Amino acid sequence: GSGGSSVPSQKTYQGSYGFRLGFLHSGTAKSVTCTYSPALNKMFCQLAKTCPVQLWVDSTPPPGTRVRAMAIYKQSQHMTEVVRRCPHHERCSDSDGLAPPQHLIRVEGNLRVEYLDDRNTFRHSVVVPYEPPEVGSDCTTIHYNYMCNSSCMGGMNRRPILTIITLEDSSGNLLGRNSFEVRVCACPGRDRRTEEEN
Amino acid sequence: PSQDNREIVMKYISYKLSQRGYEWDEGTESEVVHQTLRQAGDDFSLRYRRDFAEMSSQLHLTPGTAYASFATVVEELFRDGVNWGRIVAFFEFGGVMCVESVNREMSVLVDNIAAWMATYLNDHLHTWIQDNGGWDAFVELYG
Ligand SMILES: [Zn+2]
């Protein structure tokens, strides 16, 4: 139940910095942990495994810029329900010592990670500081973990979600936004190849 | 309390240095509070190697380094609040600073790093630890 049923927006906004998302061209052989279908703009992944998402930018945002991730349900009849972990996984022992147990999206490999439980919307989000690409690279890579399967009864319950990535400044004002569908499954490569047909 | 916090730091540093060729100083190997902290810190050095490298890049460790520079680096680690994950990162960063100075043939810096960690623990983290269930609450979550 969303606070006041005020769904956060998902409209693409590349903004002043040319903010876009990139994904690894991993295949669909069933030994894939993570792979992105460009035709469906949909990422398929396994629980608690690494999902690299890249941040492409035509002009470097200033320091103090932050990158937020948030999930919402894709179907309109569910957009007002907050995406939470199933009770079983919320109670299980998988704390990384940084992420509260109820959050579904995590960032791994970042000590500066921040988790928010919004006092008005009741929605979860995870925030890290934006950093320019490393030498040799042209994009900034963030490693995400989804901590429930899409099938988990009492959580998502086979409902597709979308992740919304936003560029903010120190004050939280909007600098850019992108989004993609997420299916956390058991066989990501087989499911992408299945849906990428019919 | 102040001595109790000093001990957990030195036992943490003793084990890290002993797990390499460096020797530095009843049922203590199995003591549950320290054992799970060591296992948690061993995990942290792998996943956050990028962050620890950056932190020790900022902490330009030389014989002349004062407490204040160390405190500055670790204070940034807690700027957004204290949690068990960040406290584990506080211990493992001190460990990597100690191994780094032994490897750079500056072994006597290990004493300074050890005293700094105990100081920062007693001054800033101990009140939070006692208010959030003590070390027992840490082992209840195993992190
Ligand atoms: Zn679940």
Author numbering:
A (entry chain A): 91 to 288
B (entry chain B): 7 to 31, 86 to 203
What does the publication say?
To improve the success of crystallization and to ensure that the linker does not affect protein interactions, we linked this BCL-2#3 construct to p53-DBD via three different glycine-rich linkers. In particular, crystals of the three BCL-2#3-linker-p53-DBD fusion proteins were successfully optimized for X-ray diffraction, and determined at resolutions of 2.3–2.7 Å in the P 21 21 21 space group. The RMSDs for superposition of these three structures are 0.2–0.5 Å. p53-DBD and BCL-2#3 had similar interaction modes in these three structures, indicating that the linkers did not affect the complex structure. We henceforth used the 22 residue-linked complex structure as a representative structure for the detailed analysis. Two loops of p53, the loop linking strands S5 and S6 (S5-S6 loop) and the large loop L2, insert into the BH3-binding pocket of BCL-2#3 which is composed of BH1-3 domains. The p53-DBD/BCL-2#3 interface covers approximately 1050 Å2 and encompasses a hydrophobic core and surrounding polar interactions. The involved BCL-2 residues are mainly from the α2-α3 and α4-α5 corner regions. Two hydrophobic residues of p53, Leu188 and Leu201, penetrate deeply into the hydrophobic pocket of BCL-2 and interact with BCL-2 residues Phe104, Tyr108, Phe112, Met115 and Leu137. Around the hydrophobic core, Arg107 and Tyr108 of BCL-2 form water-mediated hydrogen bond or direct hydrogen bond contacts with p53 residue Asp186. Asp111, Asn143 and Arg146 of BCL-2 form direct hydrogen bonds with the backbone atoms of residues Leu201, Gly187 and Val203 of p53, respectively.
